[PDB]
Amino acid sequence: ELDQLRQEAEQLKNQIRDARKACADATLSQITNNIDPVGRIQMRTRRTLRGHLAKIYAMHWGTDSRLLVSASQDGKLIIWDSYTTNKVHAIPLRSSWVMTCAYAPSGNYVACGGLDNICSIYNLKTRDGDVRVSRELAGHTGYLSCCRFLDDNQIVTSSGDTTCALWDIETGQQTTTFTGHTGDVMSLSLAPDTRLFVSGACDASAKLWDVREGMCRQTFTGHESDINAICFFPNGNAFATGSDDATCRLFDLRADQELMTYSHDNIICGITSVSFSKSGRLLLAGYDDFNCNVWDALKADRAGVLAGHDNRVSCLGVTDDGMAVATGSWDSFLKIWN
Amino acid sequence: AEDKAAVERSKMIEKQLQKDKQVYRRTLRLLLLGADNSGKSTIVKQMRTSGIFETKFQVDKVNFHMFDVGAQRDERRKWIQCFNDVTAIIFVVDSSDYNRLQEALNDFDSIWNNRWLRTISVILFLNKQDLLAEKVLAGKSKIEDYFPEFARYTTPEDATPEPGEDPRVTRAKYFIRKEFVDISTASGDGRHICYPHFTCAVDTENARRIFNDCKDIILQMNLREYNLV
């Protein structure tokens, strides 16, 4: 009696598909043929942040757009002052296999995680003068891929046990768990209104979740391989997904399908990091081909290449005022661009 | 809050960062891989939901980090990129269990032909040799059923520096090594070389074999960077 629920599952899977082809009335490449292009965005390396030992796997900007934390697999975080190339803090970790990093939007806390399967929150505003571990959030089976703060007492952790989880830093336990994926959930981006978040996994599927309810509102099934990087549009109604089939893909929530395909025939390497600008016009994507590219999000034309790194770009982040782009890679150096 | 005292804190951090670069460069990192049947959980005992196990040991005043990755899911195509630029991969294979030896050859094929473990050399520890000696001296389980080409294999001449045994266990154990170097010599480049060894339950020389092989791994990493190849 499994096929009675398997043939009804394929019937709703095509009823989803004919409900999307009815809405696919005009390509975004048709509405954006008469819109002017961007031009050759030629950025320059303004700062270079030296001091990490091993490869950098994650960075995150702060909301002041001046401080940033960077995670390296020598086993420590460094909070940088971007205008000075100073080191505000250097926090040694318990594990040496950190894969995610998150600066809290208040500025008081910072998070990391990795193959230890723990999200470790760090208090930076202690009266003792040193950075101490505030909470050590255990409960995931697989490795931690992405953590993102919502406020000072809640965090959303993506892991490779096919689950995402919303935590509580004071209590230390899971508020709700998100259990829809069938693969290692690799990336995670919150909405600007912090009410929804998307999560891209290794089943070539992005899923839009609700934080309060704990459901999966929409699923997005366009990619051909493992989605490594996800990023919300600044208005909260679209998102871009980077995957290992050398394709970025902009989706949308109100239409529930794919919009554009930022692919190129020369590019075979996969995408490790993806990010939008402040206006949502540029889609900066980091590649395994040692260099980041600046796609234009409405025309899908490569309008710039950032080519300063001598290894795999694994981190990318645009500030909250859109001033700079920081780009961390496996050559132990970050680079801040304008 | 003067900026001159902020850059003095930054140059007190870089002094601490330089003295943890010297510990880091003098420390060799390893990666244990192997199934649950193998004695990977026992070599860490013979040496001196948490998802990673570090095991530090020193031999001849040289520090070694092992990383017995556990508490993970089944698929490893994503976190195996983290262990790129590691010194070696200790791969432990249970040479006694005949029926599950082909999947030990299949996941050794995945390690050796991975895109990120292209430069990394594998130290095979063909474990449980005393359990292999008692299996062909009993003669019950046969290798010819699980592998059809054991009936047409003979022992090579310049081999077997063992004290005492019959060549049934030698033609057995040198064929298991031969199947694991059919993968290292055919589908691999000259950037990384396998190192087969035969290890047992209580064998205290397993930390010396790692030290001798890692000394050879760094020697070809130095012969290539000094352009003497």
Epitope: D128, D130 | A5
Partner: single-chain antibody
């Protein structure tokens, strides 16, 4: 956190006396610690400074040569060795910690003080030396400087303080606008490039003391005479 000092007593004017402050409760080796003294029935006056790691060591010109500051990061102590003790060095010697990074709050914790009785610079002038207050009003303590404290990086470097009667000074506002941690939201300090203010919006009985000021642009850290409130 705690900073307790030891030393003092009657010293002959040609004599010597070594003070010592024992830090216990914080990471002492990461804090640049100062020495600030207070003559009897007078204001505060800066004496010495030693940085985090015994790097930049700065003295005032009135104690230069005679006074040597030192540090012992394992045993968590801070010393002040005086060689020839002139009679104007009669004071109560406070020991202040100060950490320096982006967003830090220096001069945030002060010691209790030891009484040592012996028997160019940016002048800060607080005009009113006594303000009569009642609990409930909204007062404003003014402050003026010689040079403008607005540096080119973007933030002015004025530091407000409060010394309650009997106690040790505590930091209220750092960098002229930022409320310190532990201070209530009534203290809304603001100001301009050379004219400053500290508005206490609703006064309580704990707000009675001598409100000082400080600059941190040039390293002789000159204080004010102190606006004293009384109820």
């Amino acid at each position: 956190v705690q900073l307790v000092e030891s030393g003092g007593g009657l010293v002959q004017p040609g004599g010597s006396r070594k003070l010592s402050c024992s830090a216990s409760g914080f990471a002492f080796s990461s804090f640049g610690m100062h020495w600030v003294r207070q003559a009897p029935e007078k204001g505060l006056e800066w004496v010495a400074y030693i940085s985090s790691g015994s790097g930049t060591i700065y003295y005032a010109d009135t104690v230069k040569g005679r006074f040597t500051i030192s540090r012992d990061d394992p045993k968590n102590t801070l010393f002040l060795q005086m060689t020839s003790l002139r009679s104007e060095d009669t004071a109560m010697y406070y020991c202040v910690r100060s950490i320096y990074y982006y967003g830090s709050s220096p001069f945030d914790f002060w010691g209790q003080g030891t009484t040592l009785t012996v028997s160019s610079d940016i002048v800060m002038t607080q005009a009113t030396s006594s303000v009569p207050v009642t609990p409930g009003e909204s007062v404003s303590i003014s402050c003026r400087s010689s040079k403008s404290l607005l540096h080119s990086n973007g933030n002015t470097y004025l530091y407000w303080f409060l010394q309650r009667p009997g106690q040790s000074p505590q930091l209220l506002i750092y960098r002229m606008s930022n409320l310190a941690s532990g201070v209530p939201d009534r203290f809304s300090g603001s100001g301009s490039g050379t004219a400053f203010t500290l508005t206490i919006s609703r006064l309580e009985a704990e707000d009675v003391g001598v409100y000082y000021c400080m600059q941190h642009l040039e390293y002789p850290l000159t204080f004010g005479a102190g606006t004293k409130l009384e109820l």
